[PDB]
C-alpha cells in the first residue's frame, strides 16, 4: 500500500498539501498535489490516518441511558520502541556514592 | 448540534447500529437506524467522532526525508475530571503509624 | 500490602494529608498523619500511585555518552478497555430520521 | 539536582544497575552501584522518572468511604507538540497522480 516515494521526485509539503512529480505507467511524468486535511487527522497531538475501524475493533456495544454508547474497544498493537532518559536529572554523587534525589 | 434523544424514543444499539423512533416535524413518528461505523472510530481503545481537523489544529508542516510529514499539533483542551484512588493499596498501619509501602 | 483502614479509625483528608487513629501492635492507639503528595501522581486527570519497575518491560539497557540510559521498552499490552461516547454530541433527529451532523 | 556525571568517571549500565567511580568530598574516589529499577518507570514505551506531586494540579480532595481519596484533577495542559507520520503508509503514485489508498 502507498509507497509513492519510490516512484515520485522532488516531493514537498506546503501547509496541508503534498506535491510531487510522479512516474506515469508508460514512462512520462506528472506533477500533482494531495490535500492531506482529507486523509490525516490530529488526535490529542498525534497525527494519524483517517478511517473506519469500529466494527473491526470493538465489541459488546450497549446504549446507556438515553444517548451514551458504551463498548469494549481494542487498544493499539504492542511494540518495542527505543527510548532514553538522562540519569543526570536525578542521580547525584553524594560524597562518593550514587544516590537518587 | 445533535441532541436526537430529546425528540426520539425507544432508542437501542445492536452491534454498530443505533435505532430509534423519532418525532417528525408535522407530528408523526418514524423509526430509522444509523450505522455508527461510518461516524465514530476507536483510537487506542477510546471512541471518538470521525472528522477532519488537520488545518484547524496543526502548524509548521514539513517533509523530512522522502516521505515523513512532520508538524506541530495542538493537544486536547484541558479540563478537570473526577478521579479516585484507594489508599488501602499502599498505605499501611505500621504499629500505630501510617506508612507508605 | 497496605490496608490501613482495617485497623485505623476516624480517618480524614485535608489537602494531600491523610490523618487517622490507628491500633498499636501491643494495645492502645496512636494518631498520625501522612502527606500523600510524595507518592501519588496526577496522570492526565487520574490519580495514580507513583510508579517504577521499568526493567520488567524493557530490554537491552545501555549507557549512552556520560549520563544517558538508553533501552528498548514495550508499549502498553494490547487489551480491550471499556469506553463510552455521548451520541447526543452529533446524532440528530432530522424530520424523523437519525442523521450525523 | 543530580549531575553525578560531572564528578564520576567510567560509568556503566548492566540491566537496571548504574555503576560509577565518584569523587569523594575530601579527596580520593569511591565506587558504588545504584539500582535504577525503583525510580524509573516505563510509560507506554518511554522511560520516565517516578512521578508524584498530584496536589499541584488537583483540587477538592476528600475521603470517600473508609479509604478512597477522591478529587478533581486537571488533564494535560493544552500545548503544541511535535508529531510525524510516514506518508508512504497510504499515499500512492497512481499513474502519475498522488492518491490515498
UniProtKB/Swiss-Prot annotation, chains A, B, C, D:
<protein>
    <recommendedName>
        <fullName>Cyanovirin-N</fullName>
    </recommendedName>
</protein>
<dbReference type="GO" id="GO:0030246">
    <property type="term" value="F:carbohydrate binding"/>
</dbReference>
<feature type="disulfide bond">
    <location>
        <begin position="8"/>
        <end position="22"/>
    </location>
</feature>
<comment type="subunit">
    <text>In solution exists as a metastable domain-swapped homodimer which very slowly converts into a more stable monomeric form at room temperature. Under physiological conditions it is unlikely that the dimeric species exists and indeed the monomer is more active against HIV. Interacts with HIV-1 gp120.</text>
</comment>
<dbReference type="InterPro" id="IPR011058">
    <property type="entry name" value="Cyanovirin-N"/>
</dbReference>
<feature type="disulfide bond">
    <location>
        <begin position="58"/>
        <end position="73"/>
    </location>
</feature>
<keyword id="KW-1015">Disulfide bond</keyword>
<dbReference type="GO" id="GO:0050688">
    <property type="term" value="P:regulation of defense response to virus"/>
</dbReference>
<comment type="similarity">
    <text>Belongs to the cyanovirin-N family.</text>
</comment>
<keyword id="KW-0930">Antiviral protein</keyword>
<keyword id="KW-0430">Lectin</keyword>
<comment type="function">
    <text>Mannose-binding lectin.</text>
</comment>
<dbReference type="Pfam" id="PF08881">
    <property type="entry name" value="CVNH"/>
</dbReference>
<dbReference type="InterPro" id="IPR036673">
    <property type="entry name" value="Cyanovirin-N_sf"/>
</dbReference>
